[PDB]
Design a protein around this ligand. Structure first.
Ligand SMILES: NC[C@@H](O)c1ccc(O)cc1
Ligand code: VO4
Length: 424
């Protein structure tokens, strides 16, 4: 299995739909390695829940929580962590307004080597219960023979790129993790890292992050052969007064690069209303009416969440994926799973007449390119060749459909659990 791409377990579907799926308890189990230390990068944390996901034998090993919380929220997290002597925190600097530390990553240092997990789930129970979420699992990276001279680098430059990503935090506690990574052999890695980090980037530095990083990799490591672009996500930023301001101009321009129909997949109200969670699934789909009302034009690109292929049409998506399928959707030129939602905050926007890329947040994903496996393209696995986790082709919103908008009421029809939704 060359991809090592997994979905999280969903409670309450037929067990057949959880056969190749992973819960965090599985990821942290002793079968995966004898744990010594770990770092947990994320956005939201429930510390009591998190510690419980570790096997009892490992619960006292050091854990570093990497977060972006400030003021009172930061206070709250420290309070959550206080009781656990083995837990340290690293506040990632967020010097730009409206940025978040949104990266979901685990660094797992074992007696036997090192593992990197890049995923989409917050570290709270509900994100691992009945949502569609995605995971990439690195191989077990061995320590470099303490007596030999090797880079430990892969053809995709994953090791150097991961170090550069951690270096951007400028954080004492991560330097230690950087040193650990230095000591291991990551040469078997066959994916490319795509990161976002907060800043304003000029010239050559523009290629390092966000959608320009993606553009760069697609220019260099894909070849060009009407192949649509698909974007799928759970949060929607303010994209501008029309499609030409950002979405179709710089964003789509990066996505269609190689060596055009745009499908966007975002749950409708109906998708949410009849999900396994009902309306409260919408708590993790924070599209606000203030944003939506500025950009009604966007919604003509929206397609319903549908995942009969994975038994997950009723498990609302918190995964974010981007991809480039062929005209008949039977193959893809590339696939990306990442933390990055559909916002300029996450992906970058051009400033100062296009000489500067502004990114607000930390984001992280892995790009699957056929060239890294010695191929031109991947055939799509039609029944969860690349395991695309939702149905193709994507289905357009019907005429009575609306995008899920979190902060308005839904009181005309009850959800799965016989409840209404009145946010306030
Ligand atoms: N702000 C916390 C809550 O609204 C939330 C947190 C994480 C998400 O991915 C979506 C929503
Ligand atoms: O954690 V957020 O998409």
């Amino acid at each position: 299995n060359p991809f090592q791409f997994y979905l999280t377990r969903v409670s309450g579907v037929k067990p057949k739909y959880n056969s190749g799926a992973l819960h965090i308890k599985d990821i942290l189990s002793p079968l995966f390695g004898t744990l010594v230390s770990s770092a947990q990068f994320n956005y939201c944390f429930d510390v009591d829940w998190l510690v419980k996901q570790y096997p009892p034998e490992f619960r006292k090993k050091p854990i570093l929580l990497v977060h972006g919380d400030k003021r009172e929220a930061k206070a709250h997290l420290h309070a959550q962590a206080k009781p656990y002597e083995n837990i340290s925190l690293c506040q990632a600097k967020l010097d730009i307004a409206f940025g978040t530390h949104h990266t979901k990553m685990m660094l797992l240092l074992y007696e036997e080597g090192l593992r990197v997990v890049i995923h989409t789930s917050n570290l709270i129970h509900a994100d691992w219960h009945q949502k569609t979420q995605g995971i990439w699992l690195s191989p077990l990276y061995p320590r470099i023979a303490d007596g030999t001279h090797k880079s430990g680098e892969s053809p995709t430059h994953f090791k150097a790129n991961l170090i550069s990503y951690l270096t951007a935090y400028n954080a004492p506690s991560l330097k230690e993790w950087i040193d650990v990574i230095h000591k291991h052999d990551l040469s078997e890695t066959n994916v490319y890292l795509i990161g976002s980090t907060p800043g304003r980037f000029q010239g050559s530095q523009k290629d390092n992050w966000g959608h320009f990083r993606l553009k760069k990799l697609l220019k260099d490591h894909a070849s060009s052969m009407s192949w649509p672009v698909v974007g799928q996500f759970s949060s929607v930023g303010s994209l501008g007064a029309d499609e030409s301001k950002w979405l179709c101009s710089e964003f789509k321009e990066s996505m269609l690069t190689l060596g055009v129909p745009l499908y966007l997949i975002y749950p409708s109200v109906e998708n949410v209303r009849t999900s396994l969670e009902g309306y409260p699934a919408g708590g993790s789909l924070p599209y606000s009416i203030q944003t939506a009302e500025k950009q009604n034009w966007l919604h003509s690109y929206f397609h319903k969440w549908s995942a009969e292929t994975s038994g997950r049409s009723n498990a609302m998506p918190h995964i974010k994926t981007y991809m480039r399928p062929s005209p008949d959707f039977s193959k893809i030129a590339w696939f990306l799973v990442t933390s990055a939602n559909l916002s300029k905050a996450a992906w970058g926007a051009l400033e100062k007449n296009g000489t500067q890329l502004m990114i607000r947040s930390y984001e992280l994903g892995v790009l699957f390119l056929p060239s890294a496996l010695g191929l031109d393209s991947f055939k799509v696995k039609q029944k969860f060749t690349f395991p695309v986790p939702y149905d193709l082709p994507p289905e357009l919103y019907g005429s009575k459909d609306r995008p899920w908008i979190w902060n308005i009421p839904y009181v005309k029809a009850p959800d799965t659990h016989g409840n209404m939704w009145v946010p306030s």
